[PDB]
Amino acid sequence: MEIKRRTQEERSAATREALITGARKLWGLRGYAEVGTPEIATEAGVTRGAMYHQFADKAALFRDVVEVVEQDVMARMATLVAASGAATPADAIRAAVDAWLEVSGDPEVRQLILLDAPVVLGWAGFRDVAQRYSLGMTEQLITEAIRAGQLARQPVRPLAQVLIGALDEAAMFIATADDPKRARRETRQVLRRLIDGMLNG
Amino acid sequence: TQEERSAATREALITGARKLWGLRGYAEVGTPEIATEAGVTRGAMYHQFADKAALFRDVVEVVEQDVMARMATLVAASGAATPADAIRAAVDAWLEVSGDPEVRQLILLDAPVVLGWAGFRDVAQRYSLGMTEQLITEAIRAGQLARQPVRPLAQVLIGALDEAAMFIATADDPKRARRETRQVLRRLIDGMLN
Ligand SMILES: Clc1cccc(CN2CCNCC2)c1
Numbered sequence: 001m002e003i004k005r006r007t008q009e010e011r012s013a014a015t016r017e018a019l020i021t022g023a024r025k026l027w028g029l030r031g032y033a034e035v036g037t038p039e040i041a042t043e044a045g046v047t048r049g050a051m052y053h054q055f056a057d058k059a060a061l062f063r064d065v066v067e068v069v070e071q072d073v074m075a076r077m078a079t080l081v082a083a084s085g086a087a088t089p090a091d092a093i094r095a096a097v098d099a100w101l102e103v104s105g106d107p108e109v110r111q112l113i114l115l116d117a118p119v120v121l122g123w124a125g126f127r128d129v130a131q132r133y134s135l136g137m138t139e140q141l142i143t144e145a146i147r148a149g150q151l152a153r154q155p156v157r158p159l160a161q162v163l164i165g166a167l168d169e170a171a172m173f174i175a176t177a178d179d180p181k182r183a184r185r186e187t188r189q190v191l192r193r194l195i196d197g198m199l200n201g
Numbered sequence: 202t203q204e205e206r207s208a209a210t211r212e213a214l215i216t217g218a219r220k221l222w223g224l225r226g227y228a229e230v231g232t233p234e235i236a237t238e239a240g241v242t243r244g245a246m247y248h249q250f251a252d253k254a255a256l257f258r259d260v261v262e263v264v265e266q267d268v269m270a271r272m273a274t275l276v277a278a279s280g281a282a283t284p285a286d287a288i289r290a291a292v293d294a295w296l297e298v299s300g301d302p303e304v305r306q307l308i309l310l311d312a313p314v315v316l317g318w319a320g321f322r323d324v325a326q327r328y329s330l331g332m333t334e335q336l337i338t339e340a341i342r343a344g345q346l347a348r349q350p351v352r353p354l355a356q357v358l359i360g361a362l363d364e365a366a367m368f369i370a371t372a373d374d375p376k377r378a379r380r381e382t383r384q385v386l387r388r389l390i391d392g393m394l395n
Pocket residue numbers: 093096097100133134137138141142163164167168
């Protein structure tokens with residue numbers, strides 16, 4: 001029965017991927033509140049029953065969209081830091097700040113992660129997502145700066161958690177601004193002062 | 202008067218709810234228990250508060266008012282001689298007041314969940330921004346912070362300060378978490394203060 005089981009699993013996975021892809025596209029453009037699951041099923045080319053089979057409700061589909069978008073946010077940030085030509089751990093942290101403002105400025109990321117997710121997931125769910133995706137990259141950037149003597153030896157997690165709070169509030173300030181270009185410049189300038197006050201190099 | 206009697210009933214309910222939810226959390230104490238603590242009938246309680254969440258919203262207001270009054274008292278008594286020293290005193294005052302067990306449970310743990318993201322952010326901003334922006338404005342005026350628009354720095358610092366408090370709130374060793382987090386916050390602000 002293994003070909004039959006694997007075939008049904010692969011078909012389920014393809015349906016799931018089409019639904020997430022469709023939902024990510026339409027909610028990214030219009031917002032969660034403005035696109036219903038029937039339109040998303042049509043976009044994905046699946047029936048309502050195929051959708052019900054994969055997702056209990058609209059919010060369950062949104063939770064899976066956030067996972068895929070967060071995975072792409074962190075991969076894009078890692079690509080931009082890798083391509084930055086950062087010569088030291090301190091330069092990699094500055095590159096990571098620039099990458100966060102760039103990727104969180106993507107209109108789809110702004111809409112799904114910064115505007116919809118805190119409301120649709122609620123506080124606990126949104127903070128659990130932010131945490132699962134932010135902590136590893138932040139702790140490793142700190143660890144490498146300590147190892148190079150560019151940051152004081154200290155417990156990594158308390159510093160990581162405070163910086164994640166500062167960086168996520170910076171992104172939210174820009175996302176909710178009516179003049180986001182000015183907000184992004186002003187916020188970039190605050191984070192430059194905060195990071196450059198911390199880093200020894 | 203009827204208004205004075207209504208106000209006494211309201212005060213008994215807010216006081217009782219603050220006490221019981223302060224100890225056990227919003228999720229773990231129902232309105233029947235609170236009405237018993239307050240010595241108020243359920244009918245008289247539902248007349249004042251549509252539902253559990255409505256009573257909680259009024260508890261958060263009274264607790265937030267006390268948090269900010271206590272912050273102002275501690276900074277006033279700190280002996281801070283300069284705007285930079287007032288900011289340093291306010292960081293210490295926030296870790297002291299957010300360490301109060303009732304503030305920890307009601308503001309750091311329950312309010313974001315019960316009020317929801319948007320509701321909580323509105324209350325947190327309405328209570329945090331005045332004091333934060335005043336402290337920053339005085340430091341900029343004294344030359345001790347870089348010339349810059351106040352609101353962006355205020356919002357990023359409130360994010361750091363609230364995240365520090367919430368990290369301590371759920372720590373396995375809160376005393377240790379507080380010490381290590383106080384060091385981070387003092388170093389973060391010292392890197393920007395002249
Ligand atoms: Cl140290 C550092 C500097 C810049 C960016 C990051 C990662 N972000 C943290 C906030 N949530 C998004 C990811 C870490």
